[PDB]
């Protein structure tokens, strides 16, 4: 026969076949535990990603709401004309800053919601 010369070398012991049935050096429960640990530890990336996404999504809301509250405090407190003349430019700067934050958020969101497939 063609392969009898090789198949004659395949003669195992009782202990050998028991060890094979049990799968000593082929199941590796330590490897399974390592995989489980790594897989559970890999859940931190989801939290990081959601944090980044929420921050980039609320950035314009913050620029529009909290700085707006500050501007509103200033408006409520100021009465004269010189200070108002000077504060109009701060308001315009806040407009430009809001648009800048919106551009930044658009960029980061198109980066975070881009899928290859």
């Amino acid at each position: 026969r063609p392969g009898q010369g090789s198949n004659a070398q395949f003669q195992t012991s009782l202990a050998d076949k028991t060890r094979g049935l049990l799968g000593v050096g082929f199941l590796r429960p330590t490897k399974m535990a390592s995989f489980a640990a790594t897989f559970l530890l890999n859940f931190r990336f989801y939290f990081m990603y959601m944090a980044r996404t929420t921050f980039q999504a609320v950035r314009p809301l913050l620029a529009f709401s909290v700085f707006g509250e500050v501007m509103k405090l200033v408006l409520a407190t100021m009465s004269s004309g010189l200070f108002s003349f000077l504060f109009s430019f701060v308001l315009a700067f806040e407009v430009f800053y809001f648009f800048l934050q919106c551009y930044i958020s658009y960029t980061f969101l198109t980066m975070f919601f881009t899928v290859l497939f």
Binding site: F39, N42, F43, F45, Y46, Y49, Y106, T110, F113, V115, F117
Partner: protein, 52 residues
Amino acid sequence: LLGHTTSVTMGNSDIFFLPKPSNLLKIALPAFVFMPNLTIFTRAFPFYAHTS
């Protein structure tokens, strides 16, 4: 009328209508992805979901 006061119901009032003039636009617009595509690479999803 003890157990009959939470049964007087009134319906909502929102109307979901908004004209969609596309003749005004000539460029595409960005769109969100809401869910991961599980129809492709289904078997590896738990293993590659955490990457980017």
